[PDB]
Amino acid sequence: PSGVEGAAFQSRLPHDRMTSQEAACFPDIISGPQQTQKVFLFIRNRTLQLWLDNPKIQLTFEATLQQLEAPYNSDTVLVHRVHSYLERHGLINFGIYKRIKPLPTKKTGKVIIIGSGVSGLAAARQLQSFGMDVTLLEARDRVGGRVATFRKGNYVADLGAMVVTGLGGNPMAVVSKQVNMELAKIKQKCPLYEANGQAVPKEKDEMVEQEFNRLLEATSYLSHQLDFNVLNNKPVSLGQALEVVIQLQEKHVKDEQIEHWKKIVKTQEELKELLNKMVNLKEKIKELHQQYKEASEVKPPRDITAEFLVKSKHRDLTALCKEYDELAETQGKLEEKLQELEANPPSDVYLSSRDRQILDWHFANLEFANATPLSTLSLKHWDQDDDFEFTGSHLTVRNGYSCVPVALAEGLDIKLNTAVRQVRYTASGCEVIAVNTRSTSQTFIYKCDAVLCTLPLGVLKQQPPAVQFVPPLPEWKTSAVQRMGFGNLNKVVLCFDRVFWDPSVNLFGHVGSTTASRGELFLFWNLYKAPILLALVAGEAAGIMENISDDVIVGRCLAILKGIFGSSAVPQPKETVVSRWRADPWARGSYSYVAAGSSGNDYDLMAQPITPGPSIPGAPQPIPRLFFAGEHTIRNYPATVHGALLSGLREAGRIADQFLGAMYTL
Amino acid sequence: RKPPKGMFLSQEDVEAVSANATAATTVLRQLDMELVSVKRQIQNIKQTNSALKEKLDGGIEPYRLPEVIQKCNARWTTEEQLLAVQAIRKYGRDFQAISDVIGNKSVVQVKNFFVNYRRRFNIDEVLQEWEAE
Numbered sequence A: 001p002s003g004v005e006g007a008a009f010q011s012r013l014p015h016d017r018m019t020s021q022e023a024a025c026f027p028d029i030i031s032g033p034q035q036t037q038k039v040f041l042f043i044r045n046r047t048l049q050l051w052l053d054n055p056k057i058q059l060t061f062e063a064t065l066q067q068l069e070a071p072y073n074s075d076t077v078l079v080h081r082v083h084s085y086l087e088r089h090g091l092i093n094f095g096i097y098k099r100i101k102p103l104p105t106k107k108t109g110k111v112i113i114i115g116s117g118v119s120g121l122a123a124a125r126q127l128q129s130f131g132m133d134v135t136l137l138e139a140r141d142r143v144g145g146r147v148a149t150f151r152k153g154n155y156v157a158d159l160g161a162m163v164v165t166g167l168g169g170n171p172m173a174v175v176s177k178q179v180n181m182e183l184a185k186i187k188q189k190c191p192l193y194e195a196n197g198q199a200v201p202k203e204k205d206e207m208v209e210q211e212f213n214r215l216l217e218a219t220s221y222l223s224h225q226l227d228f229n230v231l232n233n234k235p236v237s238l239g240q241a242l243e244v245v246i247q248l249q250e251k252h253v254k255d256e257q258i259e260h261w262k263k264i265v266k267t268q269e270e271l272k273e274l275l276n277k278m279v280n281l282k283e284k285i286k287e288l289h290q291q292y293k294e295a296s297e298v299k300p301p302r303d304i305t306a307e308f309l310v311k312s313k314h315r316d317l318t319a320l321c322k323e324y325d326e327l328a329e330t331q332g333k334l335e336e337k338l339q340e341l342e343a344n345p346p347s348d349v350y351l352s353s354r355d356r357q358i359l360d361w362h363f364a365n366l367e368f369a370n371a372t373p374l375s376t377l378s379l380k381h382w383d384q385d386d387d388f389e390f391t392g393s394h395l396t397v398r399n400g401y402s403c404v405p406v407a408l409a410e411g412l413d414i415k416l417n418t419a420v421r422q423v424r425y426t427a428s429g430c431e432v433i434a435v436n437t438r439s440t441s442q443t444f445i446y447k448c449d450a451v452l453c454t455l456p457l458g459v460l461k462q463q464p465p466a467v468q469f470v471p472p473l474p475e476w477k478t479s480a481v482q483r484m485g486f487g488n489l490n491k492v493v494l495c496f497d498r499v500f501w502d503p504s505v506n507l508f509g510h511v512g513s514t515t516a517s518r519g520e521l522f523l524f525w526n527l528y529k530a531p532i533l534l535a536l537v538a539g540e541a542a543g544i545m546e547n548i549s550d551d552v553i554v555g556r557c558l559a560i561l562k563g564i565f566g567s568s569a570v571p572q573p574k575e576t577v578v579s580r581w582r583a584d585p586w587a588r589g590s591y592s593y594v595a596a597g598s599s600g601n602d603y604d605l606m607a608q609p610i611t612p613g614p615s616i617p618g619a620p621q622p623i624p625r626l627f628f629a630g631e632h633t634i635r636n637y638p639a640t641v642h643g644a645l646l647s648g649l650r651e652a653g654r655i656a657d658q659f660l661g662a663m664y665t666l
Numbered sequence B: 001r002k003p004p005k006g007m008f009l010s011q012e013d014v015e016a017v018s019a020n021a022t023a024a025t026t027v028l029r030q031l032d033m034e035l036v037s038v039k040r041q042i043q044n045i046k047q048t049n050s051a052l053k054e055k056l057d058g059g060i061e062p063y064r065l066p067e068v069i070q071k072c073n074a075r076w077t078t079e080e081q082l083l084a085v086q087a088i089r090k091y092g093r094d095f096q097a098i099s100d101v102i103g104n105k106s107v108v109q110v111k112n113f114f115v116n117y118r119r120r121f122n123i124d125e126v127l128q129e130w131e132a133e
């Protein structure tokens, strides 16, 4: 989209309609005349346009007002209100931009942010901008968390987030203009090689892909039309549904085979009844002929009964011969009708074992995208976020995604190697207990007005806990934590000192031998101008490979590659890295997924701040004090970098609203 | 709205395959058995029909009588009247047969004969005797 409407679209807003959030801050406007609403929308869209046109610099209220034509600049209060609203909610003036108005010298309020991945960093920048005192506590010796790059010389390879999933409506589009990420498109051509190392003809590839898509569509029918979402009081998983659909297709193949062979028998039976008639008729004819001869041998002269006998038998014989010729005509029709059926059998199987292996590659691919086996995904909600996908091609950060968090960290107060152990939140304030990761005896106490927790869902799930909340979190929250899924997936980085593969081929697949092992090194990426290959480990394989040494993993990789490019070809790698996100105590998995038994609503529950009870009995309802962000807290964009970024922007706005108060809601 | 084309999925099907842990394997084996059962039935009739065909080997060639064409005649010779009377006795109403037997008299000519000589050849009395056979 273009113009002011493009700005709305790029900000994930409907251009011609006010949002729920906007209603809450502009109740006077949304409940008033349509014309006023249109004025508001234009001011909002235009303000967004100005910011998006040049996000490398702070868009001020004055700057905004100066670039609105009449009569829109004829209501300065409304403009100021809209501006503060957008600014507060992070729709403008987020990221890294050179500021015009210096930061307020005296700060207001103290916030401790747990974790310095993208959600934490984004929130910190916002809070600092709003004038709050902010400190981030990070367990690792680095920033960016699940955004982890690997460097040696010029070789650069992401072990964590790697893809920017389309720029249309993506906040990373603004970030990419602010930071100098080198974005590169991803050619979707992906040849596959069977376990024996020989390539898959692109006949099969297409057919199997189409079937894979047809099967997904089929599970959606099972879910929405037949309401097949519960089985034995248990939520149905995508895996289960697919197994059912496949079994039904196998059943149909056998049902058709049966009806085909039954048509043959039915016809085969008509034939035998006709043949029996013919055999009996031939006997009758053979007998009549003999009689007709005996009659014709009574030489004339002859009385009229003798003559009658000859003529009579003659007629009866011809009549019967006519009957036989008719039946012989029918015999030729049935005989040919059989050579037709015998030549046209219905298909033999639903899937040849080769077909099934290739199909499993596609499932492995889906298991990789969702970082979890298909048997764990909710059939009803696994794709609940599909309607919010961005437009444009998927891209990779050529110079490593870490450039983003590293940049976002500039000028923030971050305490590295500080692992939070306990979070105390009271009517009067919070205190956070943390230790030094390099010598656990060293203890730190941080007092603040509010705590923003961006601990990964994997960490929140840890049992026994890694981080203790005092008082314990309420059941509505802990249950949401128990219900949601936290997946896993791994990468193997193979650095060579020379190329040996097709450099224009962006990525290619290895088709596993069995279903069990479908996710084992099923895909290889060739992503940089550098000579590096990245191997993926997905589904059930992800968890198991983590228990296997690097050498055995790398050995398997080389074995696969030798099978594809030739044993002579592929040289020994210069360096290798294997990720193990599940074992990583600061992540304990890769990212969330909608588990069977869960739903999107759980993501909302993860987001809801906690407000402690009163310190003094009979005292008024406190302020909320414990807040949450992270990839696992944003229903519409979960499991991504943009999702984490948006979650931080959201909490920063909510915290600032709570402790600095809104100006803009009169 | 509906399942993708060629994919088959009824309420009834689904319930059967999901009723228990190995309901699917049961369904598929019970069909493998019905399938094997019907190919035994094919082999058997194929063999039955092979034998029956070899019984009709040679067809009805030695039994054909090269049949003469000969034109009509609206005149009734004594010979023909007697042939007809006997033909009626054997075949009854069947005008086509009676015509064929006499050889030179059309169906209409035969039908007429029935009326014209009904009296003289006690044709009703003859017909009632064909009816007792």
Ligand SMILES: Cc1cc2nc3c(=O)[nH]c(=O)nc-3n(C[C@H](O)[C@H](O)[C@H](O)COP(=O)(O)OP(=O)(O)OC[C@H]3O[C@@H](n4cnc5c(N)ncnc54)[C@H](O)[C@@H]3O)c2cc1C
Binding pocket: A114, A115, A116, A117, A118, A119, A120, A137, A138, A139, A140, A143, A144, A145, A146, A147, A159, A160, A161, A162, A163, A164, A165, A418, A419, A420, A421, A454, A455, A456, A459, A466, A467, A489, A490, A581, A585, A586, A587, A589, A590, A591, A629, A630, A631, A632, A638, A639, A640, A641, A642, A643, A644
């Ligand atoms: C293998 C993999 C590939 C991915 N690929 C993509 C992709 O291609 N595209 C995409 O958009 N997204 C991708 N993601 C998702 C993306 O990386 C995450 O959604 C996002 O980076 C998470 O941000 P966060 O701040 O919510 O989480 P985190 O980065 O986990 O932030 C949390 C921080 O808290 C720290 N912490 C943990 N415990 C403590 C403690 N006790 N005390 C103090 N600090 C603590 C962590 O170490 C971390 O720095 C991928 C994720 C993985 C795992």
Ligand SMILES: Nc1nc2c(c(=O)[nH]1)N[C@@H](CNc1ccc(C(=O)N[C@@H](CCC(=O)O)C(=O)O)cc1)CN2
Binding pocket: A163, A165, A186, A368, A369, A370, A389, A394, A395, A638, A639, A640
């Ligand atoms: N939208 C989209 N969103 C996502 C995922 C996805 O997978 N696609 N997966 C999760 C995030 N992790 C990844 C991991 C790998 C890739 C990746 O590399 N994907 C394919 C795209 C898959 C697609 O067609 O949607 C590509 O080559 O561009 C993208 C996101 C959650 N959000």
Ligand SMILES: [Cl-]
Binding pocket: A140, A141, A142
């Ligand atoms: Cl690390």
